[PDB]
Ligand binder design. Structure first.
Ligand code: FAD
Length: 493
């Protein structure tokens, strides 16, 4: 079968392109490799009555207008999230938490006063574009440097400030790979705006965005949705002509398709798997970004050791979990006193394994390692008297007495259900992506938004977060999508 447009990938960028293109009148097929679900890195589970988000959970709608507008268009309500969160240095640098020390370094790199919040607040995408293209540090373009290198530069931080960023986990958790300085500076500048505070979540779980989008698409007769179909090959039907032949694996076999246009709504790893089928000038740029790891771990406990309102805790260097969130039922509507713990572990999973997992299912060994981790935290709280972890007095005396081994066993045994998502694993290969130093991102984005095998047809496109100007977010996926959608002509009469 021939299709006028084929979109490979049913994550948010792919489905959004399907929507815009359907609305413009094109006839199109969306291929999604997973047999069981749509939405890609947007994944929500109901776990013992709790909403577990393996991907996005909270949003900042003022920083993410395309997302906000899409939600509004699809009748996806956003609900304000009010829940809780969070000496030896030189004079200038004493005072500041890690974020503020980072900000200072950035502000100084950009030749600004650290307190210059009005400039941060004023910066637009066009400013950001001039920053990546033109900003330099000691004569070197920032797009050419690692962000560690940038932060380490003459006149930016004291030698000790650098050490302190190391100890707070800045380089272990937040900036794990020393990626593109220009791109990191832009991203932090945006995130440091005043307006960047009002937090929301999606009513009914993040996957309600996907479900609404799917419902809309199902109402457009010029859209076909095919789950369980993975693009595994593409080439021109004939060299020098635009029409593409596609090879598609299904559950039970394969299908060969023809199309005039192919949207690859895919991140780095799935494109790497297609590398030999892609035009050379695109293939050779697939490593312009790297993938960031994330393991999202959820477990529901029959006998939680924390109360309603417990705030999330962030961890520092050498603690493989970036962050632990705690959840309880609303204390009026609390049938069972069950709680849920969400742990984000942002180090390479083979490093986590080699340090924390007893070899003698992998899932069960990982939960065990996490029970021990949590046990140490509970013991240190019980012994501490002032702790960010507000234990009860039931908990406080039990855990005070119990050994570490007994605390581990107790936590382990209280787990009635768990889920683990390792985003680094095939087929995703990453939670999100970042530009390499030495890459001019605007050139890659320009090449990827429309390209071909040399005929000039410009009828292949890459869209998604991975190679966007706003990595880490749905907003990035949507910006990348719009870049390519602006290159696609309205359908033939
Ligand atoms: C832990 C985590 C936290 C996040 N936090 C936030 C946050 O706070 N805010 C926010 O805005 N964003 C957040 N994001 C990102 C957001 O989830 C976006 O969906 C993501 O950034 C990408 O959407 P996308 O279309 O690029 O691709 P994906 O979501 O990667 O979709 C790609 C799709 O392609 C399919 N596929 C792969 N190979 C093939 C093939 N060959 N053929 C067919 N289909 C194929 C996959 O099955 C997948 O469904 C987070 C992500 C994660 C994982």
């Amino acid at each position: 079968t021939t299709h006028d447009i084929v979109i490979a990938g049913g994550g948010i960028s792919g489905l959004f392109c399907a929507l815009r293109l359907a609305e413009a009148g094109h006839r199109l097929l969306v291929l999604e490799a997973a047999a069981d679900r749509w939405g890609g890195r947007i994944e929500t589970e109901e776990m013992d009555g709790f909403i577990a988000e393996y991907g996005p959970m909270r949003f900042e709608p003022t920083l993410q207008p395309r997302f906000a507008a899409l939600c509004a268009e699809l009748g996806v309500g956003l609900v304000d999230f009010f829940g809780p969160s969070a000496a030896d240095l030189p004079e200038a640098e004493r005072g500041l938490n890690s974020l503020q020390l980072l900000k200072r370094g950035i502000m100084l790199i950009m030749g600004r006063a650290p307190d210059d919040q009005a400039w941060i607040d004023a910066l637009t995408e066009a400013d950001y574009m001039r920053l990546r293209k033109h900003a330099q540090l000691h004569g070197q373009p920032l797009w050419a440097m690692g962000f560690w290198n940038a932060l380490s530069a003459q006149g930016i931080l004291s030698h000790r400030a650098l050490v302190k960023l190391r100890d707070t986990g800045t380089f272990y958790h937040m900036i794990p790979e020393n990626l593109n300085a220009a791109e990191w500076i832009i991203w932090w500048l945006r995130a440091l705006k005043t307006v960047g505070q009002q937090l929301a979540s999606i009513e009914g779980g993040s996957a309600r965005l996907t479900a609404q989008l799917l419902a809309r698409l199902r109402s457009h007769a010029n859209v076909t949705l095919a789950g369980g179909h993975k693009l595994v090959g593409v080439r021109p039907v004939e060299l020098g002509k635009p029409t593409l032949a596609l090879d598609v694996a299904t559950q039970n076999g394969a299908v060969t398709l023809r199309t005039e246009r192919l949207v690859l709504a895919l991140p780095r790893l799935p494109l790497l798997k297609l590398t030999r089928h892609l035009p050379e000038h695109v293939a050779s740029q697939l490593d312009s970004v790297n993938g960031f790891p994330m393991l999202a771990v959820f477990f529901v406990c029959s006998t939680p050791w924390w109360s309603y309102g417990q705030a999330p805790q962030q961890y520092a260097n050498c603690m493989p979990t970036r962050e632990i969130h705690y959840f309880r039922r609303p204390p009026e509507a609390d049938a069972d006193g069950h709680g849920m713990v969400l742990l984000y572990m942002d180090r390479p999973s083979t490093e986590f394994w080699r340090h924390y997992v007893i070899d003698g299912d992998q899932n069960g060994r990982i939960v065990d390692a996490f029970a021990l981790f949590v046990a140490r935290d509970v013991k240190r709280a019980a012994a501490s008297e002032e702790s960010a972890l507000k234990l009860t007095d039931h908990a406080r005396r039990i855990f005070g007495d119990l050994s570490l081994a007994e605390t581990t066993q107790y936590i382990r045994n209280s787990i009635i259900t768990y889920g683990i998502r390792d985003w680094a694993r095939a087929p995703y290969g990453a939670a999100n992506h970042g530009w390499q130093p030495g890459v001019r991102s605007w050139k890659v984005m320009e090449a990827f938004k429309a390209f071909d095998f040399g005929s000039g047809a410009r009828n292949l496109h890459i869209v998604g977060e991975a190679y966007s100007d706003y990595q880490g977010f749905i907003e990035g996926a949507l910006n990348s999508a719009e870049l390519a959608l602006a290159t696609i002509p309205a359908p033939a009469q």
